[PDB]
Structure formats: C-alpha cells, structure tokens
Amino acid sequence: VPPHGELQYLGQIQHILRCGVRKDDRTGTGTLSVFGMQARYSLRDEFPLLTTKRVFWKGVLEELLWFIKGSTNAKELSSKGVKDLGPVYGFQWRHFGAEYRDMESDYSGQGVDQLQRVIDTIKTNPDDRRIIMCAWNPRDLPLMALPPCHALCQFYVVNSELSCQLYQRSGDMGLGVPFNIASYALLTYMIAHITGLKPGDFIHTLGDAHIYLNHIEPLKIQLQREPRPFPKLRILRKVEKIDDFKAEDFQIEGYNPHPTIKME
Amino acid sequence: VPPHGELQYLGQIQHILRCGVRKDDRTGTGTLSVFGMQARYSLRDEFPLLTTKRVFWKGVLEELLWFIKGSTNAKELSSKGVKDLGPVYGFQWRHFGAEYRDMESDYSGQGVDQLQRVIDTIKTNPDDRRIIMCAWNPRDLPLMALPPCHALCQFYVVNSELSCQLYQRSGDMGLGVPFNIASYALLTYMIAHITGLKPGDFIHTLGDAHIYLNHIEPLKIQLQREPRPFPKLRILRKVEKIDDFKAEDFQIEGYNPHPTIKME
C-alpha cells in the first residue's frame, strides 16, 4: 500500500450455531454466519487469553513483534518458531501508502507510520477521536482502486486508561477470533506501556462473524468447558520505544487453559 | 478526497448517564462518554425511526438524497427546506479519491463511485466480504497525509436480505444518533430496492459514544417515554438507479412519536 469475559465469546459461538445462516466464503467450505457482533474484554489487571482451549500465545507474541518491525520476510517469523510475503500488515502498519518493492528494500521515511502516529497522537492529544490505524488484505490491493480495509483499530483514552476497538470485516470464530483477541489486547498493553497509560478495555467488533462447518463439532465441545479465570500479562522491562520490545519482555502468569483444540 | 428495537438506544443512553466518564471534545463543551457500543435494528416490515421523540424525517430523506447526487452545494439542500461546502459526504460517496475543485466542476468519471461500487458488488457477488463504503470529515483531509475515515458502512447479503453495519468513530447520542439511524436504515432500504433484495438488519456501532452535558436533562426525560411501535417505509415507485430516487417516492406510515425534543 462480574461475569467472566470469555462468556461473551462462548455466547457468540452458541448464537451462531443456533441462529447463524449458511453462507459460502471466497474459497474453502461453507459457514454458518451472523452479521454484526461485539464483545468487550477488560484489560484491567487481567489479560483476555481464552481458557476454554489452549491459545497459541507463543505465536501471538511472535507474530505481533514481527508486524511491529515491519518485516515482510516470512523466514524472519518461521525461524522464531511459529510457522517475501508482500505488503503484509507489518509493512502497512509502519509504511502505509508507500509502494512495496522487496523484502530487503529500505523504506525508511517512506509512507505513513500508522503505529507511531497512534502513539504520537495519544501523547499530543489523548482526547483525539481519530486515533485510528488500518490494515488491508494484501490480495485486495491489486484487485481494485482504493480497496476497502480488512480491519481497523480505534484507540481511546480517558482517566489515564487506554482502550482499543478492533473492527474486522469478517471473523473466523473458531480459528481466528481467539488468536486475534490476544493479539490486539497485547498491542494495547504495549502501546499503553510506552504512553504511560493503564490498559482499559478491548472491544472486538465483527462484520461477518462465521463458523466454518468443519469447526462446528469442535466448538460444540468447547462450549461445554467452563472458563478459568484469565491470566495476567507482565512487562518485565521498561520500554520507551514500541520497536524496543522483545519477546523476553513479556510473561503470562496464571494461565490455566483447557486442552488444545485443533481447528482445520 | 421480541423487545422494541428502540429499547437498545434508550438502554445505551441510560448506560452512558450512569457509567459514562467526563471527556472533552474537540470544541464545544464536555461530555459523558463510553467507548464501544453496538445496537441492531431490524428493517423487516418496519423502519427504525425513533418514537421517544419526533425525528426530523424530512431532513433525513432530503439530506440523503442530496448526498446521493454528490452535490456539494448547500443552497441545493437549504432550498429543499431542511436548513460550496467542499468535499462533503456526497462528493466522497460518488467521487472518492478524485480531487475537489468547485461545486460547479464536473467530476464525471472522476474518482471511485463507492456507492455504485457497493450496488455493483451486491449484484456481482452477494457473498463478498468487502462491500464497504467510507466517509471522511472534510476538516481532516488537509490535516494530515492519509487521514482516518469518520464512518464506514459494510453491507452483507444472505437469504435475499441486505444488512448494513455503520461504524462511526464517535456518536453524538442526543442529536446525531437518532438521525443517523434513520439515515442509514433508509440508505439500506434504497440499495435493497434497486438490487432486488429485502431489507435485513441495520447494525449501528460506535467508538466514542457520548452525551453532551447540555443534553443530559432532556435525555433523562426522553428515557421516561415508552416507545411506540416503529412505523413502516413504503417505496411507492419502482426504481432501477439509485440516482432516480425522489423524495416523493417514499412514504412513512404509522409514525406515532412523542413530542419533539430540542437538543442544543
């Protein structure tokens, strides 16, 4: 280019199963879909890493750190242990609107650094209503002129607390949502850390909220599992720049999830 | 560049009053604010024109028709009886990304026609997850490079029904929200009409949902009013082009609202 927060996710799954309508996706299989959903996860002295199934936290932290450095090299992520990709979210977050060339091209000072702009705006005017960052699906870029974004994050500050609202055009409830809740909650913790603010709430809003048919049986089982109190996220070191964050700087404490659930 | 749907709005007002936090806006006065809200209004055999106060339907229909013709001339709206404005929503909806000149300049074939693209995409692929249109606040355009949008509409189709989700960066709950609910519900009715689909749901999602302090007393009173069944919207004529719609083509039936409420 207070009830356990997890209950909302479980309620949404249950709602899609009973009320969702069959709808085909771009490619793959059919889904059960509902349009328009929203859930709020408190980030106050607790982290929304879902417990009704073991979430791949290692992949969340590692993928996010990869996006922050604006690296578009998959080999730089696959090595970290999580398994030229083009203008991925990383390139978009730090070099928005530039012009992608290669994974080795230096885009220093090229394009708008949406991420730094968010941090800068939080510092220059916490009341600002335009603290927004957007991401596109790489495959849409060459498809048309001025294509719509895939997701957007809006930040909000009040009473020394930072909140974030993620709006996603579509959400794969079985495989994608649990992971993304952790990803953006984490991003919020990071930004809050460097702007001297305390994490507030993470609001997850979806357009086409859907469950792939091959995930129905596994989710029905996940629904029988009672949530365990959410863990906590600790930032061991004091960081001043969003680029100075390292995986070793974060530590999940008290995470007691139910067994892993494989979603095809 | 089933409970009355209105109860959600009333519930949101009540929630902001009791839990909202004081937060100052760009210019004006203080507000009570809550970040992250969502409400769903069925458009099936009923129209969400709020009844706990008389909504200015004449202004809604007239303003929307003005946006559709992409006119940026205020005199063209003030004459209709609703009371060069620059790249307003109208210009953005039909000539996105062009380059604004004057209110008399011909932008035929200039910029992306987001509105027609939405209608075209609904016809070419109803399952598409990118049926999105965006609007910017004119004042932000010259403020920075690639400024964030102010609102976005995402359309969704399934079972021959068209739904729309409006995401607004911020919502003035007392004066703006009731009006906008009608505006976008109407847009959905129009698009559905020309694409041969039936209106589904209208989802209204907000970022900074706020109540201006000078609206607190009036809203407290509005809250004591019991909603009356929503009216119906009838499209008297058969239209094939979104540009062929005329005010005389719409008729609100059964609208029985409580007295008008003045919001400063």
Side-chain angles (χ1 to χ4, degrees), chain B residues 6-12 14-15 17 19-67 69-74:
Chain B
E6 193 166 348
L7 287 177
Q8 303 170 84
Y9 169 83
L10 299 171
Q12 297 180 313
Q14 184 172 59
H15 175 65
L17 291 179
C19 306
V21 182
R22 281 295 297 287
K23 185 167 185 281
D24 290 353
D25 74 345
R26 184 176 62 70
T27 47
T29 51
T31 71
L32 283 187
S33 164
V34 159
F35 184 62
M37 292 200 121
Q38 192 174 77
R40 174 186 307 269
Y41 296 98
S42 180
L43 302 175
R44 307 183 188 76
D45 203 48
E46 74 182 70
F47 188 86
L49 187 60
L50 303 204
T51 63
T52 49
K53 81 173 184 181
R54 181 178 299 282
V55 175
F56 189 35
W57 169 250
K58 194 65 240 175
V60 179
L61 174 55
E62 222 58 63
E63 179 198 51
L64 190 62
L65 294 179
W66 178 59
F67 284 148
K69 56 185 167 187
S71 180
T72 61
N73 173 59

Side-chain angles (χ1 to χ4, degrees), chain B residues 138-180 182-190 192-193 195-200:
Chain B
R139 64 187 305 295
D140 296 326
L141 303 180
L143 289 173
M144 67 187 88
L146 310 175
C149 46
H150 175 282
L152 74 80
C153 296
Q154 191 190 333
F155 291 94
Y156 172 97
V157 180
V158 80
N159 293 174
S160 301
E161 284 184 0
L162 175 68
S163 293
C164 168
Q165 173 162 20
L166 171 69
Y167 177 99
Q168 289 181 302
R169 195 166 73 185
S170 67
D172 171 352
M173 295 295 291
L175 180 65
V177 172
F179 188 90
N180 285 155
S183 300
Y184 289 98
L186 173 54
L187 181 60
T188 300
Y189 258 78
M190 292 175 101
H193 183 75
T195 54
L197 297 172
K198 304 177 295 179

Side-chain angles (χ1 to χ4, degrees), chain A residues 121 123-130 133-134:
Chain A
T121 304
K123 293 176 181 181
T124 62
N125 188 190
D127 282 340
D128 206 316
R129 294 169 172 179
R130 309 160 300 197
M133 171 173 11
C134 303

Side-chain angles (χ1 to χ4, degrees), chain A residues 17 19-32:
Chain A
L17 291 179
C19 306
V21 182
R22 281 295 297 287
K23 185 167 185 281
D24 290 353
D25 74 345
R26 184 176 62 70
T27 47
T29 51
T31 71
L32 283 187

Side-chain angles (χ1 to χ4, degrees), chain A residues 64-65 186-190 192-193 245 250:
Chain A
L64 190 62
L65 294 179
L186 173 54
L187 181 60
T188 300
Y189 258 78
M190 292 175 101
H193 183 75
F245 272 117
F250 304 81

Side-chain angles (χ1 to χ4, degrees), chain B residues 220 222-234:
Chain B
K220 286 179 169 182
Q222 196 179 332
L223 283 171
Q224 300 298 294
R225 301 175 175 188
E226 177 185 296
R228 272 75 174 287
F230 277 137
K232 290 181 179 64
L233 174 61
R234 304 282 184 170

Side-chain angles (χ1 to χ4, degrees), chain A residues 1-12 14-15 17 19-67 69-74 77-118 120-121 123-130 133-180 182-190 192-193 195-202 204-210 212-215 217-220 222-234 236-239 243-251 253-260 263:
Chain A
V1 62
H4 193 302
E6 193 166 348
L7 287 177
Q8 303 170 84
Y9 169 83
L10 299 171
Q12 297 180 313
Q14 184 172 59
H15 175 65
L17 291 179
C19 306
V21 182
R22 281 295 297 287
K23 185 167 185 281
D24 290 353
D25 74 345
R26 184 176 62 70
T27 47
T29 51
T31 71
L32 283 187
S33 164
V34 159
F35 184 62
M37 292 200 121
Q38 192 174 77
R40 174 186 307 269
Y41 296 98
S42 180
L43 302 175
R44 307 183 188 76
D45 203 48
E46 74 182 70
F47 188 86
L49 187 60
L50 303 204
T51 63
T52 49
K53 81 173 184 181
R54 181 178 299 282
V55 175
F56 189 35
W57 169 250
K58 194 65 240 175
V60 179
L61 174 55
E62 222 58 63
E63 179 198 51
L64 190 62
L65 294 179
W66 178 59
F67 284 148
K69 56 185 167 187
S71 180
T72 61
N73 173 59
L77 183 68
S78 183
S79 68
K80 307 293 160 52
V82 293
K83 310 296 179 176
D84 195 300
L85 299 174
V88 293
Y89 280 21
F91 176 90
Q92 295 176 44
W93 280 18
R94 316 312 301 280
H95 311 291
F96 178 46
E99 183 183 306
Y100 195 74
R101 292 175 292 178
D102 299 303
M103 51 175 248
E104 300 302 300
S105 303
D106 178 288
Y107 307 92
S108 298
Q110 294 182 57
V112 172
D113 190 332
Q114 302 194 71
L115 184 58
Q116 194 52 58
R117 183 158 75 182
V118 163
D120 284 350
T121 304
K123 293 176 181 181
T124 62
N125 188 190
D127 282 340
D128 206 316
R129 294 169 172 179
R130 309 160 300 197
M133 171 173 11
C134 303
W136 275 260
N137 186 327
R139 64 187 305 295
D140 296 326
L141 303 180
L143 289 173
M144 67 187 88
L146 310 175
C149 46
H150 175 282
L152 74 80
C153 296
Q154 191 190 333
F155 291 94
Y156 172 97
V157 180
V158 80
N159 293 174
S160 301
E161 284 184 0
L162 175 68
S163 293
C164 168
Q165 173 162 20
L166 171 69
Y167 177 99
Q168 289 181 302
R169 195 166 73 185
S170 67
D172 171 352
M173 295 295 291
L175 180 65
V177 172
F179 188 90
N180 285 155
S183 300
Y184 289 98
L186 173 54
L187 181 60
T188 300
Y189 258 78
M190 292 175 101
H193 183 75
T195 54
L197 297 172
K198 304 177 295 179
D201 285 311
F202 168 62
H204 197 179
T205 298
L206 297 169
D208 183 343
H210 54 272
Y212 280 95
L213 303 189
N214 52 301
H215 295 177
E217 286 305 304
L219 284 169
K220 286 179 169 182
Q222 196 179 332
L223 283 171
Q224 300 298 294
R225 301 175 175 188
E226 177 185 296
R228 272 75 174 287
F230 277 137
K232 290 181 179 64
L233 174 61
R234 304 282 184 170
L236 313 169
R237 210 230 313 180
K238 195 277 180 296
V239 188
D243 294 296
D244 301 346
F245 272 117
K246 296 185 178 183
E248 301 63 56
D249 295 335
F250 304 81
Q251 178 177 295
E253 312 183 316
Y255 189 41
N256 183 195
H258 284 273
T260 287
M263 299 274 175

